[PDB]
């Protein structure tokens, strides 16, 4: 090696590499972009989905109707000829949500009495979070013990009676329903997340502040997934009464931004929610990407003239800071969504600030528009709504209109011409220059913020497609029969609206992206029209061509190994010839048959081509291949049993002997002519004790059911002796369900598909990823959950005569449970349901214990609720405590 000629070169290369890596790390840490994944909104008018919001923006209407009437407001003495009279408002209209009164308490675990004390804000936030999680494709139950920060912007307000006076039914829950801290704690508790939970209140800029904090937390790497939004729903007209005192409200209640007829900013209400993640992680996991956030800035006006009046210097400084943080020049923004409050004094100041920030150096005319013209001021719900509108219109490539802007304000200069009002829709086609936009939000406290939004990278293009022949099952779940029917009807309607879909795509979308709720229905489709008929039948309420079953807390399955019976064995076609797992699970066992039979995969086909000494090895091969296929498809047994010839297969699947070595060692003579239950001894045995010396059905199955497994998978080409198993199951304990793998005369893969459908309907856990290892199917948007809402609102002894005694005890227990939980309809509560999902806590637990003790005059342990989570268990325990 040449001294001082080559040695230094390697060191220089290493140093350059390290410097490049360090600078890349600095750049990534400082300003990594964040991507927007999901979308959720609840806006005035008929808006319930972002698509409806985009439709409203496109047609250009307004959602100002008038004051509501469900909240029980006086609505009469709210106005008077004298505006100075106490308790008098000024606004005679505005956009108000009509769904704040209704709620679904049963879907989550919450007692109705507790639900009656819940603020509408956190009431809506749960639904928004669930919808935004479902839309992104991530199943809600998947996110457990994972870092997922939550940030919500709210305003305290007031809902019910004062704490000091108290109530009658709601006494111990007035806190947790009427505070701002729990607004994110409730979501975290329901979803089981572990990321930070923060509630922030900064007047009208709360949503923007929350999204800025979420972006910072994502950038620092503290949390891998973020969730931000805002909400503002008022139940009392006191806010309008107060805001009428300084006369800052327009009479009609319409916002006219930058117009000549400014009178006020009105009022409205709404909510919004976003899901965020850094671009690299989103790309790695293949999550959908809609747009990219780059930079934000937060600032306060400081010592402004008075308290309410804003300042222009702070706005200019924050705009410049936001532009410089993301490294985007002032001449690289096509449109700006202004505050657009429509007040008399704010508009000239905002216009001058915008001219200073952008219009001073402009080549192309900037497009200006305000969303508050269509909806009115939404308090904390603003800001995020502007971002939603910007991303929607920028995805659609069309700039929406602005109402009541035909008369520009005279106090604002327009001679420069660098700023153009959006009086008409403007096309926004994609081009070489990436599209960008900016939003702003100024509150009454003084804090103001700004942000920059950019279009998604054009890398999604390049998708390939490929046809196929295997039909994938269709599944859907709900929380109640009515929910199931509504979900089926909605799916059918949506499919009717959008034709030309791919069955594989829909099956893939429905397989992953929905929770495993305890009301299941599944089937296998053949046509886009026949599936419509099946869905219509499901919506009507009759199960035809589909498997329907209800099962909760039942997820383990058990294989059963019978003897002979499917001697037709005509399914030698396909499977090992088509199914990759069945193909790979047949030869190695067949290779074990070579020692004394020379009986490989091909001679099985040639033997059939259309003596127990040769049926037994092929029976064992079929058993092991089917077991391998099932275990590869995600379902694994909790136990296994065998017939006279099934013990060999049981040992093979238990690990007693090797995969192929088990074959020709138990069958060394070759004709003789997992925790599992030893059928010969009727007890569980280890795989080790099985040897050469080793070589009551009702009792075995009843013991297995007592152990805690309530289903069996019958692995065979034909169902055999299943009726006896069902009869024994009915005669002891709960119902015992069994499903055959295949039926004689039907060797098609559709039989396996419907078998999988029945297994899913039986509550058996299925790994859908193995089913969709690869087919050429991608995600397709689908409708969300059809909640079932109802109106909630506050305003400011025998001596063992017979088992009939047992039913009496059960009925009185049911009545007491209905009474304590606040269920007004004291007619029915779920029987198999436990108590943790009914919303009963310690406060109600001790009251129920005292009621039961007083009713029957017995002493009952405090922790009995833990001992007997079910009403049936408690009834059985108490009926055995007699005498």
């Amino acid at each position: 090696a040449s001294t001082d000629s080559e040695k230094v070169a390697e060191y220089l290369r290493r140093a350059t590499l390290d410097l490049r890596a360090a600078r890349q790390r600095i750049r990534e840490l400082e300003g990594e972009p964040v991507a927007v994944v999901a979308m959720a909104c609840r806006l005035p008018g008929g808006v319930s989905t972002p698509e409806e919001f985009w439709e409203l923006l496109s047609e250009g209407r307004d959602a100002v109707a008038g004051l509501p009437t469900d909240r029980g407001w006086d609505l009469d003495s709210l106005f008077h000829p004298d505006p100075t009279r106490s308790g008098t408002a000024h606004q005679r209209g505005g956009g108000f949500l009509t769904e704040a009164t209704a709620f679904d308490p049963a879907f989550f675990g919450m007692s109705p009495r507790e639900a009656l004390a819940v603020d509408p804000q956190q009431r809506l936030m749960l639904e928004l979070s669930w919808e935004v999680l479902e839309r992104a494709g991530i199943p809600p139950t998947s996110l457990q013990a994972s870092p997922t920060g939550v940030f919500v912007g709210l305003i305290p307000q007031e809902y019910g009676p004062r704490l000091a006076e108290g109530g009658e039914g709601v006494e111990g829950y007035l806190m947790t329903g009427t505070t701002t801290s729990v607004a994110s704690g409730r979501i975290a508790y329901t979803l089981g997340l572990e990321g930070p939970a923060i509630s922030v209140d900064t007047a009208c800029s709360s949503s923007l502040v929350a999204v800025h904090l979420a972006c910072q937390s994502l950038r620092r790497g503290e949390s891998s997934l973020a969730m931000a939004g805002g909400v503002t729903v008022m139940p009392t007209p006191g806010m309008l009464v107060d805001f009428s005192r300084m006369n800052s409200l327009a009479p009609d209640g319409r916002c006219k931004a930058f117009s000549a007829g400014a009178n006020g900013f009105g009022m409205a209400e709404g909510a919004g929610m976003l899901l965020l993640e850094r671009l690299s992680d989103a790309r790695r996991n293949g999550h959908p990407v809609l747009a990219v956030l780059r930079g934000t800035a937060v600032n306060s006006d400081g010592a402004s003239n008075g308290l309410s009046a804003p300042n222009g210097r702070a706005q200019v400084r924050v705009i410049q800071q936001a532009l410089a943080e993301s490294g985007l020049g002032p001449a690289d923004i096509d449109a700006v969504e202004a505050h657009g409050t429509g007040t008399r004094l704010g508009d000239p100041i905002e216009a001058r600030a915008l001219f200073e920030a952008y219009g001073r150096d402009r080549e192309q005319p900037l497009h200006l528009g305000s969303v508050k013209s269509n909806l009115g001021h939404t308090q904390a719900a603003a800001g995020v709504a502007g971002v939603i509108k910007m991303v929607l219109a920028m995805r659609a490539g069309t700039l929406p209109r602005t109402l009541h802007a035909s008369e520009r304000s005279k106090e604002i200069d327009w001679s420069s011409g660098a700023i153009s009002l959006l009086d008409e829709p403007e096309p926004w086609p994609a081009g070489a220059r990436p599209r960008r936009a900016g939003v702003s939000s100024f509150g009454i406290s003084g804090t103001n913020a700004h942000a920059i939004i950019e279009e998604a990278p054009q890398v999604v293009e390049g998708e390939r497609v490929e046809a196929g022949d295997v039909v994938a099952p269709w599944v859907l779940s709900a929380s109640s029969a009515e929910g199931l029917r509504a979900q089926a009807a909605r799916l059918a309607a949506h499919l009717r609206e959008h034709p030309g879909q791919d069955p594989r795509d829909i099956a893939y979308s429905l397989a992953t992206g929905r929770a495993a709720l305890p009301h299941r229905a599944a089937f296998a489709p053949v046509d886009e029209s026949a599936a419509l008929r099946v869905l219509d039948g499901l919506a009507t309420g009759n199960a035809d061509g589909a498997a329907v079953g209800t099962s909760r807390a039942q997820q383990r399955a058990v294989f059963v190994f019978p003897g002979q019976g499917w001697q037709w064995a005509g399914m030698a076609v396909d499977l090992l010839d088509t199914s990759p797992v069945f193909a790979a699970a047949l030869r190695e066992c067949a290779d074990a048959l070579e020692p004394h039979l020379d009986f490989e995969v091909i001679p099985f086909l040639r033997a059939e081509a259309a003596r127990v000494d040769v049926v037994q090895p092929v029976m064992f091969a079929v058993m092991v291949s089917l077991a391998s296929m099932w275990r590869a498809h995600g379902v694994e047994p909790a136990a296994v049993i065998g017939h006279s010839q099934g013990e060999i297969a049981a040992a093979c699947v238990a690990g007693a002997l090797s995969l192929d070595d088990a074959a020709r060692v138990v069958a060394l003579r070759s004709r003789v002519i997992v925790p599992f239950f030893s059928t010969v001894t009727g007890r569980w045995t280890q795989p080790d004790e099985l040897d050469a010396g080793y070589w009551r059905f009702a009792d075995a199955v009843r013991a297995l059911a007592e152990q805690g497994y309530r289903t069996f998978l019958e692995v065979s080409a034909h169902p055999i002796l299943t009726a006896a198993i069902e009869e024994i199951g009915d005669g002891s304990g709960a119902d015992l369900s069994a499903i055959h793998s295949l039926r004689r005369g039907d060797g098609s893969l559709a039989d396996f598909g419907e078998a999988l459908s029945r297994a899913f309907a039986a509550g058996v856990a299925v790994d859908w990823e193995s089913v969709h290892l690869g087919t050429g199917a991608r995600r397709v948007p689908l409708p969300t959950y059809p909640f079932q809402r109802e109106r909630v609102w506050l305003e400011p002894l025998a001596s063992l005569p017979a088992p009939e005694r047992e039913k009496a005890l059960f009925e009185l227990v049911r009545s007491h449970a209905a009474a304590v939980l606040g269920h007004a309809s004291a007619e029915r509560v779920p029987a198999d349901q436990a108590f943790a999902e009914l919303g009963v806590d310690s406060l109600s637990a001790l009251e129920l214990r005292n009621r039961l003790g007083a009713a029957t005059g017995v002493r009952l342990p405090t922790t009995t609720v833990f001992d007997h989570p079910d009403v049936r268990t408690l009834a059985a325990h108490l009926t055995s405590e007699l005498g």
């Epitope: 090696a1 040449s2 001294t3 001082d4 000629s5 080559e6 040695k7 230094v8 390697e10 060191y11 290369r13 290493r14």
Partner: antibody, heavy 118, light 114 residues
């Protein structure tokens, strides 16, 4: 990223012949210089050979107990290094490594057993 | 041209507190350019060797910040901060004045104190 893999290895009787393939990807292979090291099964690490780069041209030098025993080979079309085996000896039974750099031993390979017996 | 670690060959360690490995050399290196041609290597049990620090103390990327070299041209010593799990194996002192290097050296073992 930069990956190095090695292939070629098994049981060979004394006096046989063999070759070893080192595969590089993720960087401009031309500049760097390859080097082969060998660790005895239960001893330290001893350097074997080092091939220079075509920028300086040059060749290897090997060392004692290996000079005149077997040679190296290096390509440029697919960046595959070759170590030849000639008249293998039982004492040569040891794991072999291929690594980047001639003096500063940077990112290494994965190793190969390569046993010799009869 | 002859360098031996001279550090405790066993050097039992226990997590929490830090440690150090001395590396005494022959006549100092001090190349005219103003550097010391000494490197460090670490071998995990049953793993491929990896580089830790090249000339002086400028530990390369990927290496955790808990490692830090130091020393003059004839009294090199490697400092390790708070000790954690693993890091048990063989550490090697490597010179660069003589190109035809034959053997890395006996090295110093690392194991948990008991």
């Amino acid at each position: 990223e930069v990956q190095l893999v090695q292939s070629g290895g098994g049981l060979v009787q004394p006096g046989r012949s063999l070759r070893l393939s080192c595969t590089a990807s993720g960087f401009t292979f031309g500049d760097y210089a390859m080097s082969w090291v060998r660790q005895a099964p239960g001893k330290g690490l001893e350097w074997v050979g080092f091939i220079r780069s075509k920028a300086y041209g040059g060749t290897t030098e090997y060392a004692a107990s290996v000079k005149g025993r077997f040679t190296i080979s290096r390509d440029d079309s697919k960046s595959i290094a070759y170590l030849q085996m000639n008249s293998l000896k039982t004492e040569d039974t040891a794991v072999y490594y291929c690594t980047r750099g001639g003096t500063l031993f940077d990112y290494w390979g994965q190793g190969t057993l390569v046993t010799v017996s009869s | 041209d002859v360098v031996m670690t001279q550090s405790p060959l066993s050097l039992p360690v226990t997590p929490g507190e830090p440690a150090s490995i001395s590396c005494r050399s022959s006549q100092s290196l001090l190349h005219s350019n103003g550097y010391n041609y000494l490197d460090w290597y670490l071998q995990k049990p049953g793993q491929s060797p990896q580089l830790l620090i090249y000339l002086g103390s400028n530990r390369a990327s990927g290496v955790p910040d808990r490692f830090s070299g130091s020393g003059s041209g004839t009294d090199f010593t490697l400092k390790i901060s708070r000790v954690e799990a693993e890091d048990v194996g063989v550490y090697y002192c490597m010179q660069s004045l003589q190109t035809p290097r034959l053997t890395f050296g006996p090295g110093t073992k690392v194991d948990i104190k008991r």
